[PDB]
Design a protein around this ligand. Structure first.
Ligand SMILES: CCC(=O)N[C@H]1CC[C@@H](N2C(=O)N(c3ccccc3Cl)Cc3cnc(Nc4ccc(N5CCN(C)CC5)c(C)c4)nc32)CC1
Ligand SMILES: [Cl-]
Length: 294
C-alpha cells in the first residue's frame, strides 16, 4: 500500500483559546474556540477535543488523529493539528451548526427538498471519497454528519475501532465493507427524510438480525416519492453487490436534486428558508474559515 505522507501539525496551546464547551464526555471535553497562528493575522474558528491520562485512551485519540490527518475532501472532516499538553488535544475546524441530526430536528419546519437531497449528495461524495481512499467508515449515521453551513456538511467519526444502522453481514459475521457502509447511508437518509426520527423505534436490539433475514426494512417516509424510497431499499438488500455504489448514489441523488419537488413532497416547500451565512448573517472581527486557510 502506498506510503501515507499526511502532514501532522503540532500546535502550541498558547496559539488557541477555548471559549465555550460544546460537549462533555467522561473520556474528554470538546470546546468551541479560536486559533491564532502568530504573525499570520488570522483567527480560525476551531473545535478542541481534550481528554486526565489513561495509557489506552492516549493511544486511541492518536489513532483518531492519525485517520483525521490522512483525509482531505470537502465532505469529510479533517484535523488541523494536535497539541501536546499534559493531555493531548485534537484540533478540528469548527462546524458551527452542530450535527445534522440535531439540525433537522430543530429546523424541521424549514428544511425543504432541495436541502434534503443535497445533503444526500454531499454525504455520498464523502463516502465515495472514503472509498477511493479504501477507508471504510463502519459508523455512518446522521449524528456523525456535521453541518458547517446548512448548505455544506461533512462526515465525522470515521474509521475508528449501533446495530440498527448495521448491514447484515456486519451483524452476523461482523463483516465491515464499503457496501456495508452503503447500508448505513440508507438508514442515514431515512433519518433525514423523517426529519430526525429513530429507526426501528421500540425494538429489541437482538430481533433486528432476523427481522432483516425475514425481509422487513424501515418504513417509507411520508415526504418520500417511490423514487427516493426505492433507492434506500436498494441499500438494504442482503447481497452486498446488488446494493448501490456510493458513486451511483451520487449520480442518482444529484439527478433528483435538479427537480427537488418531483422527488420529495413537502407541504409549503417553497415557503421554507434556512440560514445561509451568505444570505442572512455571519454572526472578534478578523476571521478566516479553516477551509480557506489551506
Ligand atoms: C464526543 C463528546 C461529545 O459530546 N461530542 C459532540 C460535541 C463535540 C462535537 N465535535 C467533535 O467532536 N469534533 C471532533 C471530532 C473528532 C476529533 C476531534 C474533534 Cl474536535 C469536531 C467538531 C466540530 N464542530 C462541532 N460543532 C458543534 C458541536 C456541538 C454543538 N452543540 C452545542 C449545543 N447542544 C447542546 C448540542 C451540541 C454545536 C452548536 C456545534 N462539533 C464538533 C461532536 C459531538
Ligand atoms: Cl443501535
Amino acid at each position: 500500500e502506498a506510503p501515507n505522507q499526511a502532514l501532522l501539525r503540532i500546535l502550541k496551546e498558547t496559539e488557541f483559546k477555548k471559549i465555550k464547551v460544546l460537549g462533555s464526555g467522561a473520556f474528554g471535553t470538546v470546546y468551541k474556540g479560536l486559533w491564532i497562528p502568530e504573525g499570520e493575522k488570522v483567527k480560525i474558528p476551531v473545535a478542541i477535543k481534550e481528554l486526565a491520562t489513561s495509557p489506552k485512551a492516549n493511544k486511541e485519540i492518536l489513532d483518531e488523529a492519525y485517520v483525521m490527518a490522512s483525509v482531505d475532501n470537502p465532505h469529510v472532516c479533517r484535523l488541523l493539528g494536535i497539541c501536546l499538553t499534559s493531555t493531548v488535544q485534537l484540533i478540528m475546524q469548527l462546524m458551527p451548526f452542530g450535527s445534522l441530526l440535531d439540525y433537522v430536528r430543530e429546523h424541521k419546519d424549514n428544511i425543504g427538498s432541495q436541502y434534503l437531497l443535497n445533503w444526500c449528495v454531499q454525504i455520498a461524495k464523502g463516502m465515495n471519497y472514503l472509498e477511493d481512499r479504501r477507508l471504510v467508515h463502519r459508523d455512518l449515521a446522521a449524528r456523525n454528519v456535521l453541518v458547517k453551513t446548512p448548505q455544506h456538511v461533512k462526515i465525522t467519526d470515521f474509521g475508528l475501532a449501533p446495530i440498527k444502522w448495521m448491514a447484515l453481514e456486519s451483524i452476523l459475521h461482523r463483516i465491515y465493507t464499503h457496501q456495508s457502509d452503503v447500508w448505513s447511508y440508507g438508514v442515514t437518509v431515512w433519518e433525514l427524510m423523517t426529519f430526525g426520527s429513530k429507526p426501528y423505534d421500540g425494538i429489541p436490539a437482538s430481533e433486528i438480525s432476523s427481522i432483516l433475514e425475514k425481509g422487513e426494512r424501515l418504513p417509507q417516509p411520508p415526504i418520500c416519492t417511490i423514487d427516493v424510497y426505492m433507492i434506500m431499499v436498494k441499500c438494504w438488500m442482503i447481497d452486498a453487490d446488488s446494493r448501490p455504489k456510493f458513486r451511483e448514489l451520487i449520480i442518482e441523488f444529484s439527478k433528483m436534486a435538479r427537480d427537488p419537488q418531483r422527488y420529495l413532497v413537502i407541504q409549503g416547500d417553497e415557503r421554507m428558508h434556512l440560514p445561509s451565512p451568505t444570505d442572512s448573517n455571519f454572526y472578534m472581527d478578523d476571521v478566516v474559515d479553516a477551509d480557506e486557510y489551506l
